[PDB]
Design a protein around this nucleic acid. Sequence first.
DNA 1: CTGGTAGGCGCCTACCAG
DNA 2: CTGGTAGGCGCCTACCAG
Lengths: 412, 402
Amino acid sequence: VAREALVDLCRRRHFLSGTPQQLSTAALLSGCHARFGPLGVELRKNLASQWWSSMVVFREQVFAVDSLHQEPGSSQPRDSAFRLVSPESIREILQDREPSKEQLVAFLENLLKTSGKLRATLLHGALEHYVNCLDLVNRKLPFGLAQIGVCFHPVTRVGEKTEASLVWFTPTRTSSQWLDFWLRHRLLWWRKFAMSPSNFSSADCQDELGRKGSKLYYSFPWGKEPIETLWNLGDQELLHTYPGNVSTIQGRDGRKNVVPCVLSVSGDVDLGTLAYLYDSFQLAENSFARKKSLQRKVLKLHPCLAPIKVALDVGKGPTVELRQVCQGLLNELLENGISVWPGYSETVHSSLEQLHSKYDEMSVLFSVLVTETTLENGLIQLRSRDTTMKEMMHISKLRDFLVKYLASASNV
Amino acid sequence: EALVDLCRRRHFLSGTPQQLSTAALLSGCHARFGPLGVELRKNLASQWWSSMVVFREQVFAVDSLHQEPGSSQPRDSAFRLVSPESIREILQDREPSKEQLVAFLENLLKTSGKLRATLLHGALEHYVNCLDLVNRKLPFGLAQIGVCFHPVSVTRVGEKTEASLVWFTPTRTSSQWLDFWLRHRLLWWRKFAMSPSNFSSADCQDELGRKGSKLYYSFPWGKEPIETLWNLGDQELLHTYPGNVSTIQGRDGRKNVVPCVLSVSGDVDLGTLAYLYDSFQLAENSRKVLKLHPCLAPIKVALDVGKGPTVELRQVCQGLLNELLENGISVWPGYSETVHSSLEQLHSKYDEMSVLFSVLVTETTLENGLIQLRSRDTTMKEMMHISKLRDFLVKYLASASN
DNA sequence: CTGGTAGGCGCCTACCAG
DNA sequence: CTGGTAGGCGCCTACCAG
């Protein structure tokens, strides 16, 4: 019943898109449909950008990599990744000749042995770029290779998940210590944006070979779901990627030449976005909503994640002139990186109560009203998310206010 | 060509010598970019997003899958996605007859999903949803950046980063908008170019005579199309939403109309190759240099230490590096390199890496704070205090923004 | 095509409770 | 004062006869 309130709210406000059946929890978790509407896409982009700054920009010796969405096909009897086949090759064998049974078998066999397949993870792309980046860092360990990109997971249908991956190359001597560093770093990162950071947790695990790792979970209403995995792979995968002379893959550990240990850190950005939507869902606490049996709702997304930083509307006064003021203010805000909802450009009028209820459901951080008073003395009306506040401030100060507000929320 | 060699040595491009040929770079069959090229492409993409969705009126981001539903259309070359287990079953479960194999392949062509070749279908399938968002107010736009898959002349698969804007506008303002976007896109490509004349446009028409245009960059071997703009009309919009036309009508002022569909799509990957070529120039006075535009250059500033105590000198750089990162200024931490090259070797390397500013901290800085600043384009050593470096860099970037 | 009928959108003014 | 709203008006557009 409360799940039906949140998914419905996200659908109504375009955090999510889809039919009612595509919006069930099973469908959302499968990744078989494009889950996000325009506000959800912006939320996921904000989340991705936060991952990149904390995992790449502010980290030492972490470099970006790009790799293809498809990889050379294998002949392993249990490789279940979907294969890419040209329709024109199928049309040739069907329509251009009268194929025998043997030729159709031979065609289908060659499909299995040779055709490309969709990547399941981003790890292979990091391993394949390792020697190139080794030259960049003058062979010095440790360093990392980071990528955000879609991966494919069978579910007769194929789901798509946005994965954020860091592959960390370190001497075995320090691999366990680096694994603990990244685990704490990732757990702190998830928690910093949460209303209820206790709903993010970890649990140690071992893989089929006994290699050590840990997984990160978010406590959804139906149970815990893994959102991140960290593995200490050792140097197994690296030697298989580069068979032959080990001198080509040896890095510098101080003055020691060593084949590095490989740590793999991989998080699900799509599921993470779902988590923050659930985590942000609250009953409204402001006096207008609370003194009402309607039980208004608010999404309290963290300011760094909220897709819409500020909404702009007009109050009483000459509409064309007021819209002109809003337009100049919007352009100033956009130029300084502040996303704006241009409510002023609407031609149907709604009450302030209706307007502020909608903006709370959209997680708008601040609502700004431009009125005939603004035309006289430049004062605008500022209301914070889920409050009854009407703070008067000069329109020339709004930009600096919001810039410092977001900076304050960013390094807290 | 020494340019691709330079981009490989400095890790703009990746790959073996064979996949660094012109035909291999244009095909997109390998991941072409090293770490510096990935950042350059990312800067290009952000600049696209800034000028196409952030500052544009009623342009919204759209999300769509890489997979699209399959159809028996005969003129569709897009790759199909096939379960390896279905193939094993038809081959291994029992002895298959010729007819069952034909039936298997036919059913494959008719029913299997396909990898997108363009971002257009994803924008069309989200049209009705976003129409509710804008309260049916036309015009509005749906925008996405994402990888698409193209058949390449065994047959391989090419991957290209496409930046797409699909513009819905009343069929009466179609040409006025198409012309606006064309000028806006050509100006966009030229803002960052050293030789803006090497970007150009040319008109084109499709199989059924629909108006459009293509943008080109003059590579040394000839022109290559980097962006296409199409006035599609409304055939795909009606085919995407078959049935009642009331559900897809937008509001042209007070008029309810079925919108015209414009498609604007540029090749981000070919775009970064274009700018690498455009930036390649000879160094002035006293070697090569890449003079990428300041908004595009991957490395804004490089930090190094001079003669003196290697201990406390590397300490000041980290305090400065973290300050620059906090204000969105990317930094090459040259002071951690233990090889210790000369300044000539260092500046020649930074020039090849397109580093905008080179900063040197020394014991003169330890006793005062006067760092040594060097510009990529105009190579000379200007002195300035360290507490004004960030502010100088942010204002220099803002100047180059517009 | 010209131009008459009628719906209703967008903006304004004024009045009222708090 | 502030915000909600009832009532008025100028004009665009959709239809249709002619």
